[PDB]
Design a protein around this ligand. Structure first.
Ligand SMILES: O=Cc1cc(O)ccc1Br
Length: 175
């Protein structure tokens, strides 16, 4: 690796990782599962009603947005969603011990997964959680690849699954 590539490690963190997986959109749009979304993967509501989604948006941002936000507002909402995912792992008696056993880069993949799926969805993956705590990385990844989370929307999940396999940032390189 060049001095370049050894530096890529310090450029990557959970915010840059989720930013690649979720993208950045300043107007309400439907994600791959058809849920209204905005910003960096902020799911507004699972209602098919755009009006509900606009309502959730104005609550979340605190102004009359009419479906559109700024980059700064997107980043603020993103930071809030990241903190919620972390806090949801740390208070959960099933997820915390597994998270504590992980290295720094797989801990980012765990926060990413909870950001995407929510706590109860992730904590339900009993086999994946035990494989990870036992450092059975290849099996954990194969089992994540069976999930509906990955299969209904592979492009948003694939790099998280690669990161659980390898504990490196390689899947985020060379976009
Ligand atoms: O915390 C979330 C999480 C998510 C996973 O897919 C595996 C392990 C953990 Br600890």
């Amino acid at each position: 690796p060049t001095t370049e590539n050894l530096y890529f490690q310090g450029s990557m963190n959970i915010f840059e990782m989720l930013r690649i997986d979720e993208g950045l959109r300043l107007k309400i749009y439907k994600d791959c599962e058809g849920y209204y979304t905005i910003g960096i993967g902020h799911l507004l509501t699972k209602s098919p009603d755009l009006n509900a989604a606009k309502s959730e948006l104005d609550k979340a941002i605190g102004r009359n947005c009419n479906g559109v936000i700024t980059k700064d507002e997107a980043e603020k909402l993103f930071n809030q969603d990241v903190d919620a995912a972390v806090r949801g792992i740390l208070r959960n008696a099933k997820l915390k011990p597994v998270y504590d056993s992980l290295d720094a880069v797989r801990r980012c993949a765990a926060i990413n997964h909870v950001f995407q799926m929510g706590v109860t969805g992730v904590a339900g993956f009993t086999n994946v959680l035990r494989m990870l705590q036992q450092k059975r990385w290849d099996e954990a990844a194969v089992n994540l690849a069976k999930s509906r989370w990955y299969n209904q929307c592979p492009d948003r999940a694939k790099r998280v699954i690669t990161t659980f396999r390898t504990g490196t940032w390689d899947a985020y390189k060379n976009l």
